[PDB]
Write a protein that binds this DNA or RNA. Sequence first.
RNA 1: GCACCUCGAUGUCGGCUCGUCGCAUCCUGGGGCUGUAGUCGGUCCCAAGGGUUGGGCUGUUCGCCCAUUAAAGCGGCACGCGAGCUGGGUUCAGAACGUCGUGAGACAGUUCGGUCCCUAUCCGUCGCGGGCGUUGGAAAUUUGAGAGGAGCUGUCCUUAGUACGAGAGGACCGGGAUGGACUUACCGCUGGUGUACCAGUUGUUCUGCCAAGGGCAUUGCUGGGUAGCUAUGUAGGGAAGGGAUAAACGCUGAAAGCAUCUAAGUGUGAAGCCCACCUCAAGAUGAGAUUUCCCAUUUCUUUAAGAAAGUAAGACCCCUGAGAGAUGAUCAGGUAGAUAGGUUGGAAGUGGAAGGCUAGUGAUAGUUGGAGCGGACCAAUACUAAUCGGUCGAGGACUUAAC
RNA 2: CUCGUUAAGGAACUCGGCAAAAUGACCCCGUAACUUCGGGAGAAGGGGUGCUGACUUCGGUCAGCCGCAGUGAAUAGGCCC
Lengths: 207, 124, 114, 56, 122
Amino acid sequence: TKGILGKKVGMTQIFTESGELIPVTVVEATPNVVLQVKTVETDGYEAIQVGYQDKREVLSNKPAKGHVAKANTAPKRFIKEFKNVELGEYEVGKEIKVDVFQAGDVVDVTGTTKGKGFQGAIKRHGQSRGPMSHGSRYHRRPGSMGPVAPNRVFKNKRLAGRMGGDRVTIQNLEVVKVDVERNVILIKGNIPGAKKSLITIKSAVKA
Amino acid sequence: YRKLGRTSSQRKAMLRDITTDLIINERIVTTEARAKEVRSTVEKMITLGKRGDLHARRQAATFVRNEVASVREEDESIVVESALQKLFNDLGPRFAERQGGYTRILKTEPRRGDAAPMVVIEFV
Amino acid sequence: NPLIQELTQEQLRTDIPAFRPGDTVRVHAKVVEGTRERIQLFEGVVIKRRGAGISETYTVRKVSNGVGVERTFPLHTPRVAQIEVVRYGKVRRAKLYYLRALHGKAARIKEIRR
Amino acid sequence: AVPARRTSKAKKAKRRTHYKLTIKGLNACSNCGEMKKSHHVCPACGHYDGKDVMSK
Amino acid sequence: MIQQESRLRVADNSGAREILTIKVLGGSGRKTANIGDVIVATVKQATPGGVVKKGEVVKAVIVRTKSGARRADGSYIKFDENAAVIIRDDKSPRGTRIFGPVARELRENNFMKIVSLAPEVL
RNA sequence: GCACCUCGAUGUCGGCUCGUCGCAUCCUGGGGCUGUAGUCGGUCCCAAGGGUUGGGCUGUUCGCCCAUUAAAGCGGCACGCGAGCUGGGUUCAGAACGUCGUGAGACAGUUCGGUCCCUAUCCGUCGCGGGCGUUGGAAAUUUGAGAGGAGCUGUCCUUAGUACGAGAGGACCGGGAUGGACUUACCGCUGGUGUACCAGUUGUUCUGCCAAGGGCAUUGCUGGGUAGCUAUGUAGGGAAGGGAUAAACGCUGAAAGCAUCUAAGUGUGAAGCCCACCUCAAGAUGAGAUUUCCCAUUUCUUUAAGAAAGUAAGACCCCUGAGAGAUGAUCAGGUAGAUAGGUUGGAAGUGGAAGGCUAGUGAUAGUUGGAGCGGACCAAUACUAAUCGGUCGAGGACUUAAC
RNA sequence: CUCGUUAAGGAACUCGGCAAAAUGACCCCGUAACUUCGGGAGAAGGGGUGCUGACUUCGGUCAGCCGCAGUGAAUAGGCCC
Ligand SMILES: [Zn+2]
């Protein structure tokens, strides 16, 4: 249905009408452009291809310019597909701007979490330590690997490894304010990801 | 900002020495990590040498090494210049009208006993 | 930074008098007791101020009935109505955390004209 | 922990297939022709970027 | 935050001075208590004479903690002490006098007989 | 009970860390009977999705006690887990008590003390790359065969002091609010840290002296604190639904003129099952789909899916890096340039610089002046360094059919 | 592995406060039961400490000044039943 792509700027505060303080996250989204329309006769399902964030032109190649030429735009940096939206009602060239949402509008928000590197079982999985005194030599370790009988370790025995960097969505957040001349949405709470990272905002699945 | 294999006071000693060299010599051979950290420190000294006043002089004198000479000078005496005196009489007036960027690095070769990549860092 | 300051600019208060940690202050808070609106007053010494923007706060220390009380406020809430400077103090630092372990006469701050 | 069986010639050599050397970007000097590492000074003649550098 | 084996002063006229916390009623593994929360405790130090004698198991409500409370408008309050008031199983003080100042959260939790006798209500 | 197994070695119990499976079910869900008025209960049937607490005393399981909870289940896994921890206990050498023995000594009697080694080859488990394949060479967007996560539950308010009942007492079925434990992100707030940030102060030594500073003493010590990483901080979540079923309950109905849920026909029905929500996924050798980009030299073994050479679209080596990181990979850039350093303004932070002046016998104070300084943060600016270059990379098989 | 700091709580840890943290110098005041009359005893528990000037009988005392902190670093008993 409704849905837009933008970038993450940062967090701030705001007072409401009644005079309550509320933490917020600024998202900036210049106008998105519809590049392609997928149908059942051609593709086998129904969707919409959207682009965001204009790109300098030494940085693209000839196949990309050909794909962006039928829509009369500059080459884009981020291209996603938006599903479950009554097609009609849409055509290549159209611009989706932030006034698609209004204040209220419980929404879903997705991103890619920050990266953290190679991490141990205690930080990565919330596992608890061993004792720090009393003759102990077992501080920061992942536990026993299993029982003796099967002569092997089972799967989903959790260990150390690379942490972060996965996609995550958070459900049922509120739009606090929409500003049109600046292409800005204010969302109540915190979102996943670092600064300048891609963010997607859709109307909520659980309604 | 690059720990360089040293503790906190040995890093400071080593940088204070390598930037007082290159004030005295104007061209030096070193490894590649040290040269980057040093480009930063030396240009911070030159923009105090261009400021000129007493407060700037005493700010620099916390960082430039003291009992070192830099002499190509004799009218008729043994008249010594002090490597802080050179900073304030010679190198500041040289770069008067240039904005930042008073140095440059070139890459040469790995050292024989080490394979450490070496580098020349000079002024103009 | 400048995209955030622009959005939050139109919500900063302009009637805020100048004060430092060390000065004494009367805050004119607002309380809601059921449907009634009413105003309290909270008099004490400013001991903290940590800042930059709409996110600025300060805190005030008081001794009520033999127990010490601290109350932190944002600088720009509309739920305060008045900040009045009563005295000026002579102080040598920014965080007066050493006041929270003294009592009576040892916790005295000298005055100063400004 | 101790090796329970010796390793044969085929498995040793299959381990050792990612254990080689590389000789990366080598170009020809613009001033004197001979080969040299890119973004480095030319060791044969001391010229980098069309000028003389290891001289006074 | 107040947990098992924390010690509280008594802000009451009941004959108790110090109290040791035994449980943090409400839940099944809950850790900490706050301002307006009910507790089970031991009397550790009494006063010579008094309705309440030392060694007794009794209930009390927390006012006045060090790590204090937070209000909806963005403001905070903190005290220099931890204190409690011994309670009579339908929220009435077993004494007749509260000492010292009291947090305003005791209204929302409906200890209205206690908010009548406190000297100051912050 | 037996003595097949292991004596050129298969390390005991409780606790810790990490769990997994059965169901003879401890709670929560659905039911039939009651010596079921209501509120609570007894017992039997279906059900393994999730849940199942902190202390005191003992080396202790076991057990008793205290305070809570919806509840404080019972078993298997070498009575799970010592090349993962502990070594309190049992079972080495010392010493003592009761007791037995002429004695040396002895006791599932007791007491105080008492050495636990290992640099991971193979399979396995968690993460991360290179090679080739997917039948011209490439840049992007994707469907979903499969798979994994998640799955708990309390109190109040209303219906209503209504049904029920002499009274005491007190509902089903609905609607609304707010919690506990657990968990996914994040640094605006409250705090933690913050060894190239600011200030105060002791001893001694150096910059020739005074003033002003540097070195060392755990960062010498003490008071604050930016970015980054963080919880005890802040936001969210387990929402509502559909389908086929278990116990149970039918509707219509004969065999067997009646009766009967069943044989033919036809329904209802659970926290369970398949979807619904989140994440991974075409090496799914059954290797899928859509949009865009690029189009022919030389000798012949013989003309063949032939070899070799230069190229297109595109890619890489090499260099500046960080929102990324063990390395490699990923992402932002390479003068068609803000990629990193420097410079010029700013900010957080500290809290009033140096040099002079004025008032003091002095220690010091006031003033010039919210001063000076300022890692990582914010804008602008080609001043230095991303120079010059090289490498790889298509020419698209055959059969049948319809057009 | 060896070090430094930590909100709120403060032995809830474990066979056992193991290991850490806390006390620590000099001057002054004070100090129980018990006892072989020597002890117990540094019992316990409290106060002072920098810098300038004046007087200093002598040893110190008064007036003033500065900081969160004056044995401003390093070195040095935890105690009780
Ligand atoms: Zn050359």
